[PDB]
Amino acid sequence: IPTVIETTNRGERAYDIYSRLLKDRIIMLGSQIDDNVANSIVSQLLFLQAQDSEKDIYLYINSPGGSVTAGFAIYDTIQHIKPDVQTICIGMAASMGSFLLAAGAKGKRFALPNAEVMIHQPLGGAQGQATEIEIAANHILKTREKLNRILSERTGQSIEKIQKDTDRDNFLTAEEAKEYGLIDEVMVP
Amino acid sequence: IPTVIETTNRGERAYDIYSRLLKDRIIMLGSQIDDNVANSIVSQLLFLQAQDSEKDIYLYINSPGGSVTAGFAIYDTIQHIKPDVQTICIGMAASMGSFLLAAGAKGKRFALPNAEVMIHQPLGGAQGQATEIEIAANHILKTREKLNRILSERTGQSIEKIQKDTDRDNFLTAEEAKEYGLIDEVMVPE
Amino acid sequence: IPTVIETTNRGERAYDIYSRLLKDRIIMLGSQIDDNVANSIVSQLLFLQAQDSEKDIYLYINSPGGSVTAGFAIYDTIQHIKPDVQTICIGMAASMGSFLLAAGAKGKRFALPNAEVMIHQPLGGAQGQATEIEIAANHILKTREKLNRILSERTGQSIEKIQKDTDRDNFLTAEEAKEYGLIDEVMVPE
Amino acid sequence: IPTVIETTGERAYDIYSRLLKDRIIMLGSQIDDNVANSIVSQLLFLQAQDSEKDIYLYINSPGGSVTAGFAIYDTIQHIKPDVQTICIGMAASMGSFLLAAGAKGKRFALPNAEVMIHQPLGGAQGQATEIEIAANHILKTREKLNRILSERTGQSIEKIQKDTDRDNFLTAEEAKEYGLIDEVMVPE
Amino acid sequence: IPTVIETTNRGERAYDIYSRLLKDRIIMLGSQIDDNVANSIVSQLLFLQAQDSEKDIYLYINSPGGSVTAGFAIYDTIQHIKPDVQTICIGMAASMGSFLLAAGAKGKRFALPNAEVMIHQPLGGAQGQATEIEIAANHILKTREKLNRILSERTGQSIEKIQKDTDRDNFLTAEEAKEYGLIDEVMVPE
Amino acid sequence: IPTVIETTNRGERAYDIYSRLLKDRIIMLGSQIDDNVANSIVSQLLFLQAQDSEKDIYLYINSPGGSVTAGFAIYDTIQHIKPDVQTICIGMAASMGSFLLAAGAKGKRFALPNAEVMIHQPLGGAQGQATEIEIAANHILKTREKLNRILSERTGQSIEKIQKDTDRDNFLTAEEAKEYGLIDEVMVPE
Amino acid sequence: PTVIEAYDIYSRLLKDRIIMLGSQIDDNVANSIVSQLLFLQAQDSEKDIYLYINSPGGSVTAGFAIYDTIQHIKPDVQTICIGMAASMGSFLLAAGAKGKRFALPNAEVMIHQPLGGAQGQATEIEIAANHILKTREKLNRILSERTGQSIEKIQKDTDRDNFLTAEEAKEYGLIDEVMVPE
Amino acid sequence: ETIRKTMLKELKNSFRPEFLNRVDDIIVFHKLTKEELKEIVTMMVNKLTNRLSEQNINIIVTDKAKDK
């Protein structure tokens, strides 16, 4: 990761390229969404809200997805803050990545021309006694229901259509995602 | 980990995002609760109390659980310091993480809309002779009794009900947690 | 990774070789194209577009290949930024590396004399049920079709011929790549 | 580990260095040779810093090497500052030893804290003579531990031998009754 | 790597030993030649040519060999940059390292007295179907043909004799290397 | 390791704890004695001698043992430098750690009250032909004899008694170390 | 540890022209030593360089590179044997300038024939064995030149492992005199 | 517009608010354009032509020369 040095009268600022982008209100989601990445992104969003609560925050997504709880934390932080969050899909947006891609401000969710978006039902695992397996299955079904509800509210599609589309791995191009309502427009060069 | 450069009349300073949040009296608890994390949290709380003893302290919780003793250390530190400690649940607060969520000041425990909390009896393990297994089992049962007692005192629910509900994994939504007494009210978006 | 203290005027700051080359709009791609490398490349491209929207960027490529999605992200960032990007093939540009080599500005794609390029169909895997295998096969076939279409557009050659040539591993010298259309001219030594 | 900015000195510390400035030494990990060396260095530096003020030892550790604990005990007893010991979380094995090794009347424990006292662990392997030597050494180490604990708690060596035969878990109130600590820090 | 400190007219500045040598345009190649080392060497060469395009560059080679692609990338970069590149053999220069040993400018290819050089035919491997093995074998033979051609041009020696001496491992002393043509003169101690 | 602030009259200097201890001529031997640790100790002793050849050097020992050659290098550096070296046994001094403990200046070797000193014959191993096993055994016996000679010189005890006592692992307390001659006096607490 | 006046301890020793060779002699260590030697030659080409040797050995090529760098530079190189010097380490100990190779009183040195390996066809094994014999011949020739000893005697003593103490190093010509304490 | 805004914001981070509050007007100088540089060359050439004409030397500079 390269280092960027900026010279002022007061002193030297040694950014790394991600921090330099963050100076311009760019947050990069470019890895699997685990607890650490979600915590870092939440802290970045909160700091960007503090610095100025009126300008727009830009979120760049290139990730295979990850934890549902981490994605929900990011979604809650995005919806809670006053400034609008523009979501731009570079490369891939899968599982939780697509959920966060759809979570941007209306009229402000973008994707690069040959970017790929994948929607599917969450993965999980149950092990042990029958009662414990039942508890785990109930939890995962509740989580899937919540995700389908949010996606229906945020994309304008019926809950049944999203249930049918998310049964298997559905791969959508930028045009298909625009037609599906996941993104708002493709960014022409 | 991103780096934040903040300009002030005193000069320009380079922060990382977590220390920048700590400047605003915000403590991030976002990993498995082991000895090192609990030590860091206790140190941060003690320093925040030292800086000044009247403003609020904010604890953001996103953890799957961890050691019971580390969580007890964190809870005791929270209860011992004069400034009020607000707890906000980000994402998931499970096992001792949910226990620390209820440890916040009354009227100041928060949770995000699509956040989840999970309460269950503690785990453990015993190996060796029958007497050793008896000792370990007595220890784990006493730990469960202490946890249940603290939860009953902080949530207002009967010890028997918390005993029944923590028998298995209990997943609660923010509204279910509020009606159960774990949190005070959910954070409405603004 | 040697450091360099050479800077103008004050000359106090020290750079590593890659950061110093970044100031000269030199971007090095000397490893497999995964998500981390692609994200770094995209950030560097955006930073260089911000620094000056008119001057050209220099992209030295030496990569066995990598993720198709990462290469697509790099390709979109290259084709989206206003400044032109020169692709210079160092050593081997194979798989997605050759795709990014053809992604440079028209008339601004170069290769060193004793350099090698390779083009082939994308690799992948499909495991599970028959339906899942069908879905994965459809996805990989569509990815190959999109890659072939982009290569045909950027090389001016029929997609039938590219499909025929990408069936197996096709190794081309710098002159053969020039005749094929992936590059524009071979950088003769001084 | 977060970085801390002190506004009264416009100078930056890490949280552990900031605590050590206030004469706070944290024992929050397994006690091995490296950790004991660091603790002894911090204690000696603090003794150099001021001949009078108290040093604070915050203990949260499952235990560890007996020799490292003996080094820490010797350093604590040698230095003429009083060393207050506060039990944060767990004080088990050699950790409970250093808990009772603090200054009399200055041994504190958090309300919901637990301590553990038990005989030291070890192992032997080889010929009969070597195993006999190892057993003699471990028995002498246990005897010295029991003697120091009986001296610093006021209870009989026989009772400590009986209670430390197995794993003895004590609450803060039970540790107060036993004699390891002096009183429990009540919250404000 | 020890830190190295000098007092200049601009004050006292410190370097690591390799950065200090790079200040005097000394480039050290002292490990296996993979894509990372090749990327670093190419970056250093480009930086040195940008700093001053007339002065000489020095390449101290102590390498057991490496990838053919990385070595060819370094060779192309050396032959492309305007400043001359002196090459000095320290210890061992084997396989691709010996190829990079001959890459230096004529009259500026040195070697330490009791140093050893060794030329190989390139290693490789093939796996899969008969067609895939055919393609891999063709690629390896063409790579060896290119290596032999470049070696013949730089050392001024017949291609057939290079084939003969390259079929098996060929250890050469500094005097034998000088007589063969890989180096120009042995560095007599002074 | 923690960082401390110093110089209450100056306040601007901060050192790591071992650098701060090295300022007062305190050298810590608190790990297994290998080549790197011995090199660091020797370099520290040389620097301390260079800074002031009159003042005394302090060596703190807490080590289970280590290589015979590295400890012998430490012994040589201790015995060659003009300034006196005081040795204090913190915790344990076993194997060659006790040898270095006895290596201190006459009348200036101290041990803590509850400190254990262990003396035993050196370990080793031989694997190979009969001649190689004989060579290795002869070397091990020679180095044991050298250790016994030095220990007898610095302890005043007959070499037969050392041979008998070092047959097995002999654990001694501080009082028994003083009676045996390893240390000069036990550091009584203040 | 950090030495304050701030420099790391090895940097501080390098300021006094003291070069420490205290690890296995591989390519990385050889490159570091060569670079340090070149810098010390450049910084002041008239004073003397001190090399401290404590190593079990390593690569023959790395040791030969270090030997060549020592011989080529104009300023002289005193070698002081701290602890052990084995295989290539003893060779570099002998590489010191005349009258200025040192060894601590109870230090130990080792001389033995280089270790190697061969695997594959008969021709490849023959090539590897020929190279190993040539390398041993070169090592023996340089040792005979630098110790004033006959080639045959060095060959005989090097056959098996040969432990030499400081006094045996003295009468063997490996070191020039033992460093008496003062 | 954005360039002026960001330069003004950066100026606030280098001077005290009460110092900038007492300034009557803070003016941002825009970068010179192509035609502005051409006019600057024209004005300097006119000044030089006057100064050489007072010495009775007549000089004219073509448009291509001025552009170069």
Side-chain angles (χ1 to χ4, degrees), chain E residues 11-30:
Chain E
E12 200 173 36
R13 304 297 92 61
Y15 310 80
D16 66 80
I17 197 72
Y18 295 122
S19 176
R20 181 49 181 70
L21 260 63
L22 182 59
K23 191 222 182 343
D24 302 1
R25 300 171 79 87
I26 305 301
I27 294 186
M28 194 93 39
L29 174 63

PDB file of all heavy atoms in Angstrom, chain E residues 11-30:
ATOM      1  N   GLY E  11      22.812  18.812   7.323  1.00  0.00           N
ATOM      2  CA  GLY E  11      22.547  18.179   8.597  1.00  0.00           C
ATOM      3  C   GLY E  11      22.854  16.695   8.596  1.00  0.00           C
ATOM      4  O   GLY E  11      23.365  16.114   7.634  1.00  0.00           O
ATOM      5  N   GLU E  12      22.534  16.073   9.724  1.00  0.00           N
ATOM      6  CA  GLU E  12      22.804  14.657   9.924  1.00  0.00           C
ATOM      7  C   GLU E  12      21.578  13.849   9.509  1.00  0.00           C
ATOM      8  O   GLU E  12      20.524  13.939  10.147  1.00  0.00           O
ATOM      9  CB  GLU E  12      23.165  14.407  11.388  1.00  0.00           C
ATOM     10  CG  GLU E  12      23.918  13.117  11.660  1.00  0.00           C
ATOM     11  CD  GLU E  12      24.405  13.012  13.097  1.00  0.00           C
ATOM     12  OE1 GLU E  12      23.687  13.484  14.004  1.00  0.00           O
ATOM     13  OE2 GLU E  12      25.498  12.450  13.321  1.00  0.00           O
ATOM     14  N   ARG E  13      21.717  13.057   8.448  1.00  0.00           N
ATOM     15  CA  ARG E  13      20.654  12.195   7.950  1.00  0.00           C
ATOM     16  C   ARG E  13      21.054  10.739   8.105  1.00  0.00           C
ATOM     17  O   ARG E  13      22.239  10.400   8.030  1.00  0.00           O
ATOM     18  CB  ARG E  13      20.328  12.471   6.478  1.00  0.00           C
ATOM     19  CG  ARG E  13      19.958  13.901   6.135  1.00  0.00           C
ATOM     20  CD  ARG E  13      18.667  14.307   6.850  1.00  0.00           C
ATOM     21  NE  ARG E  13      18.857  14.941   8.151  1.00  0.00           N
ATOM     22  CZ  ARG E  13      19.515  16.075   8.351  1.00  0.00           C
ATOM     23  NH1 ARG E  13      20.015  16.771   7.344  1.00  0.00           N
ATOM     24  NH2 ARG E  13      19.649  16.535   9.591  1.00  0.00           N
ATOM     25  N   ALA E  14      20.058   9.885   8.317  1.00  0.00           N
ATOM     26  CA  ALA E  14      20.265   8.463   8.543  1.00  0.00           C
ATOM     27  C   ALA E  14      19.626   7.651   7.425  1.00  0.00           C
ATOM     28  O   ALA E  14      18.631   8.072   6.827  1.00  0.00           O
ATOM     29  CB  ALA E  14      19.685   8.030   9.891  1.00  0.00           C
ATOM     30  N   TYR E  15      20.209   6.488   7.147  1.00  0.00           N
ATOM     31  CA  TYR E  15      19.692   5.564   6.151  1.00  0.00           C
ATOM     32  C   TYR E  15      19.883   4.140   6.644  1.00  0.00           C
ATOM     33  O   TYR E  15      20.661   3.885   7.566  1.00  0.00           O
ATOM     34  CB  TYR E  15      20.397   5.696   4.791  1.00  0.00           C
ATOM     35  CG  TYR E  15      20.502   7.090   4.216  1.00  0.00           C
ATOM     36  CD1 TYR E  15      21.483   7.971   4.648  1.00  0.00           C
ATOM     37  CD2 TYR E  15      19.648   7.507   3.205  1.00  0.00           C
ATOM     38  CE1 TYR E  15      21.589   9.238   4.110  1.00  0.00           C
ATOM     39  CE2 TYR E  15      19.749   8.770   2.660  1.00  0.00           C
ATOM     40  CZ  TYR E  15      20.720   9.631   3.116  1.00  0.00           C
ATOM     41  OH  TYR E  15      20.822  10.891   2.575  1.00  0.00           O
ATOM     42  N   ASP E  16      19.160   3.212   6.026  1.00  0.00           N
ATOM     43  CA  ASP E  16      19.574   1.823   6.100  1.00  0.00           C
ATOM     44  C   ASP E  16      20.701   1.584   5.099  1.00  0.00           C
ATOM     45  O   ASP E  16      20.956   2.399   4.209  1.00  0.00           O
ATOM     46  CB  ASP E  16      18.392   0.887   5.841  1.00  0.00           C
ATOM     47  CG  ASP E  16      17.857   0.992   4.431  1.00  0.00           C
ATOM     48  OD1 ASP E  16      18.457   0.394   3.514  1.00  0.00           O
ATOM     49  OD2 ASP E  16      16.828   1.672   4.239  1.00  0.00           O
ATOM     50  N   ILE E  17      21.390   0.454   5.259  1.00  0.00           N
ATOM     51  CA  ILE E  17      22.591   0.214   4.463  1.00  0.00           C
ATOM     52  C   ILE E  17      22.246   0.095   2.980  1.00  0.00           C
ATOM     53  O   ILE E  17      22.970   0.608   2.117  1.00  0.00           O
ATOM     54  CB  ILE E  17      23.349  -1.021   4.993  1.00  0.00           C
ATOM     55  CG1 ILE E  17      24.778  -1.039   4.454  1.00  0.00           C
ATOM     56  CG2 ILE E  17      22.617  -2.319   4.678  1.00  0.00           C
ATOM     57  CD1 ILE E  17      25.669   0.012   5.053  1.00  0.00           C
ATOM     58  N   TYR E  18      21.124  -0.553   2.659  1.00  0.00           N
ATOM     59  CA  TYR E  18      20.737  -0.702   1.262  1.00  0.00           C
ATOM     60  C   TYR E  18      20.269   0.613   0.655  1.00  0.00           C
ATOM     61  O   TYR E  18      20.586   0.900  -0.503  1.00  0.00           O
ATOM     62  CB  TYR E  18      19.657  -1.774   1.128  1.00  0.00           C
ATOM     63  CG  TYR E  18      20.144  -3.157   1.495  1.00  0.00           C
ATOM     64  CD1 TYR E  18      19.525  -3.891   2.494  1.00  0.00           C
ATOM     65  CD2 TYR E  18      21.230  -3.723   0.845  1.00  0.00           C
ATOM     66  CE1 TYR E  18      19.972  -5.154   2.831  1.00  0.00           C
ATOM     67  CE2 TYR E  18      21.683  -4.983   1.175  1.00  0.00           C
ATOM     68  CZ  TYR E  18      21.051  -5.693   2.168  1.00  0.00           C
ATOM     69  OH  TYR E  18      21.499  -6.950   2.501  1.00  0.00           O
ATOM     70  N   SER E  19      19.534   1.429   1.412  1.00  0.00           N
ATOM     71  CA  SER E  19      19.162   2.749   0.912  1.00  0.00           C
ATOM     72  C   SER E  19      20.387   3.643   0.760  1.00  0.00           C
ATOM     73  O   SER E  19      20.477   4.429  -0.191  1.00  0.00           O
ATOM     74  CB  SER E  19      18.136   3.393   1.840  1.00  0.00           C
ATOM     75  OG  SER E  19      17.827   4.709   1.418  1.00  0.00           O
ATOM     76  N   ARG E  20      21.340   3.535   1.689  1.00  0.00           N
ATOM     77  CA  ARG E  20      22.586   4.281   1.559  1.00  0.00           C
ATOM     78  C   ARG E  20      23.344   3.885   0.302  1.00  0.00           C
ATOM     79  O   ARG E  20      23.885   4.750  -0.395  1.00  0.00           O
ATOM     80  CB  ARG E  20      23.459   4.066   2.794  1.00  0.00           C
ATOM     81  CG  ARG E  20      24.773   4.830   2.774  1.00  0.00           C
ATOM     82  CD  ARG E  20      24.563   6.291   2.413  1.00  0.00           C
ATOM     83  NE  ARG E  20      25.817   7.034   2.366  1.00  0.00           N
ATOM     84  CZ  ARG E  20      26.755   6.878   1.442  1.00  0.00           C
ATOM     85  NH1 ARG E  20      26.611   6.019   0.447  1.00  0.00           N
ATOM     86  NH2 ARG E  20      27.865   7.607   1.516  1.00  0.00           N
ATOM     87  N   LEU E  21      23.398   2.589  -0.006  1.00  0.00           N
ATOM     88  CA  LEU E  21      24.040   2.166  -1.244  1.00  0.00           C
ATOM     89  C   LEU E  21      23.258   2.634  -2.467  1.00  0.00           C
ATOM     90  O   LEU E  21      23.855   3.012  -3.480  1.00  0.00           O
ATOM     91  CB  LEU E  21      24.210   0.648  -1.255  1.00  0.00           C
ATOM     92  CG  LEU E  21      25.614   0.170  -0.880  1.00  0.00           C
ATOM     93  CD1 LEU E  21      25.954   0.558   0.548  1.00  0.00           C
ATOM     94  CD2 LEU E  21      25.743  -1.324  -1.069  1.00  0.00           C
ATOM     95  N   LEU E  22      21.925   2.620  -2.391  1.00  0.00           N
ATOM     96  CA  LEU E  22      21.112   3.109  -3.499  1.00  0.00           C
ATOM     97  C   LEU E  22      21.332   4.595  -3.741  1.00  0.00           C
ATOM     98  O   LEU E  22      21.183   5.070  -4.873  1.00  0.00           O
ATOM     99  CB  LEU E  22      19.634   2.826  -3.232  1.00  0.00           C
ATOM    100  CG  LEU E  22      18.647   3.238  -4.325  1.00  0.00           C
ATOM    101  CD1 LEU E  22      18.971   2.533  -5.630  1.00  0.00           C
ATOM    102  CD2 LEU E  22      17.220   2.945  -3.898  1.00  0.00           C
ATOM    103  N   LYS E  23      21.682   5.345  -2.693  1.00  0.00           N
ATOM    104  CA  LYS E  23      22.025   6.751  -2.878  1.00  0.00           C
ATOM    105  C   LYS E  23      23.207   6.905  -3.827  1.00  0.00           C
ATOM    106  O   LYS E  23      23.251   7.843  -4.630  1.00  0.00           O
ATOM    107  CB  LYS E  23      22.327   7.398  -1.527  1.00  0.00           C
ATOM    108  CG  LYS E  23      22.444   8.909  -1.570  1.00  0.00           C
ATOM    109  CD  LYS E  23      23.608   9.389  -0.724  1.00  0.00           C
ATOM    110  CE  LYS E  23      23.709  10.902  -0.732  1.00  0.00           C
ATOM    111  NZ  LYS E  23      22.933  11.500  -1.851  1.00  0.00           N
ATOM    112  N   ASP E  24      24.172   5.992  -3.753  1.00  0.00           N
ATOM    113  CA  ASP E  24      25.291   5.956  -4.683  1.00  0.00           C
ATOM    114  C   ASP E  24      24.999   5.116  -5.920  1.00  0.00           C
ATOM    115  O   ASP E  24      25.939   4.685  -6.595  1.00  0.00           O
ATOM    116  CB  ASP E  24      26.545   5.429  -3.983  1.00  0.00           C
ATOM    117  CG  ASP E  24      26.926   6.256  -2.776  1.00  0.00           C
ATOM    118  OD1 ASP E  24      26.208   7.230  -2.471  1.00  0.00           O
ATOM    119  OD2 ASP E  24      27.946   5.936  -2.133  1.00  0.00           O
ATOM    120  N   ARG E  25      23.722   4.868  -6.218  1.00  0.00           N
ATOM    121  CA  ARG E  25      23.299   4.137  -7.414  1.00  0.00           C
ATOM    122  C   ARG E  25      23.822   2.701  -7.409  1.00  0.00           C
ATOM    123  O   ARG E  25      24.254   2.166  -8.431  1.00  0.00           O
ATOM    124  CB  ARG E  25      23.725   4.878  -8.684  1.00  0.00           C
ATOM    125  CG  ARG E  25      23.137   6.274  -8.795  1.00  0.00           C
ATOM    126  CD  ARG E  25      23.752   7.050  -9.941  1.00  0.00           C
ATOM    127  NE  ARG E  25      23.190   6.663 -11.227  1.00  0.00           N
ATOM    128  CZ  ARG E  25      22.093   7.192 -11.751  1.00  0.00           C
ATOM    129  NH1 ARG E  25      21.410   8.131 -11.119  1.00  0.00           N
ATOM    130  NH2 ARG E  25      21.672   6.767 -12.938  1.00  0.00           N
ATOM    131  N   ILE E  26      23.769   2.070  -6.238  1.00  0.00           N
ATOM    132  CA  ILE E  26      24.154   0.674  -6.066  1.00  0.00           C
ATOM    133  C   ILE E  26      22.883  -0.129  -5.833  1.00  0.00           C
ATOM    134  O   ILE E  26      22.157   0.116  -4.862  1.00  0.00           O
ATOM    135  CB  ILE E  26      25.135   0.490  -4.898  1.00  0.00           C
ATOM    136  CG1 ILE E  26      26.356   1.396  -5.064  1.00  0.00           C
ATOM    137  CG2 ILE E  26      25.562  -0.961  -4.790  1.00  0.00           C
ATOM    138  CD1 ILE E  26      27.132   1.149  -6.324  1.00  0.00           C
ATOM    139  N   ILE E  27      22.613  -1.086  -6.714  1.00  0.00           N
ATOM    140  CA  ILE E  27      21.424  -1.926  -6.631  1.00  0.00           C
ATOM    141  C   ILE E  27      21.873  -3.340  -6.297  1.00  0.00           C
ATOM    142  O   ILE E  27      22.700  -3.921  -7.011  1.00  0.00           O
ATOM    143  CB  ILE E  27      20.615  -1.898  -7.936  1.00  0.00           C
ATOM    144  CG1 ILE E  27      20.025  -0.508  -8.169  1.00  0.00           C
ATOM    145  CG2 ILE E  27      19.504  -2.925  -7.891  1.00  0.00           C
ATOM    146  CD1 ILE E  27      19.106  -0.438  -9.363  1.00  0.00           C
ATOM    147  N   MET E  28      21.330  -3.895  -5.219  1.00  0.00           N
ATOM    148  CA  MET E  28      21.711  -5.219  -4.748  1.00  0.00           C
ATOM    149  C   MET E  28      20.666  -6.246  -5.156  1.00  0.00           C
ATOM    150  O   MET E  28      19.480  -6.095  -4.844  1.00  0.00           O
ATOM    151  CB  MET E  28      21.891  -5.229  -3.230  1.00  0.00           C
ATOM    152  CG  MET E  28      22.606  -6.463  -2.710  1.00  0.00           C
ATOM    153  SD  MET E  28      24.382  -6.229  -2.552  1.00  0.00           S
ATOM    154  CE  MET E  28      24.433  -4.547  -1.954  1.00  0.00           C
ATOM    155  N   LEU E  29      21.114  -7.288  -5.853  1.00  0.00           N
ATOM    156  CA  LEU E  29      20.284  -8.434  -6.217  1.00  0.00           C
ATOM    157  C   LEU E  29      20.872  -9.622  -5.465  1.00  0.00           C
ATOM    158  O   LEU E  29      21.770 -10.305  -5.963  1.00  0.00           O
ATOM    159  CB  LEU E  29      20.266  -8.653  -7.724  1.00  0.00           C
ATOM    160  CG  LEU E  29      19.548  -9.901  -8.234  1.00  0.00           C
ATOM    161  CD1 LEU E  29      18.078  -9.845  -7.875  1.00  0.00           C
ATOM    162  CD2 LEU E  29      19.731 -10.040  -9.732  1.00  0.00           C
ATOM    163  N   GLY E  30      20.375  -9.857  -4.256  1.00  0.00           N
ATOM    164  CA  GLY E  30      20.956 -10.874  -3.407  1.00  0.00           C
ATOM    165  C   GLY E  30      19.987 -11.923  -2.909  1.00  0.00           C
ATOM    166  O   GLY E  30      20.079 -12.360  -1.759  1.00  0.00           O
TER     167      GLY E  30
END
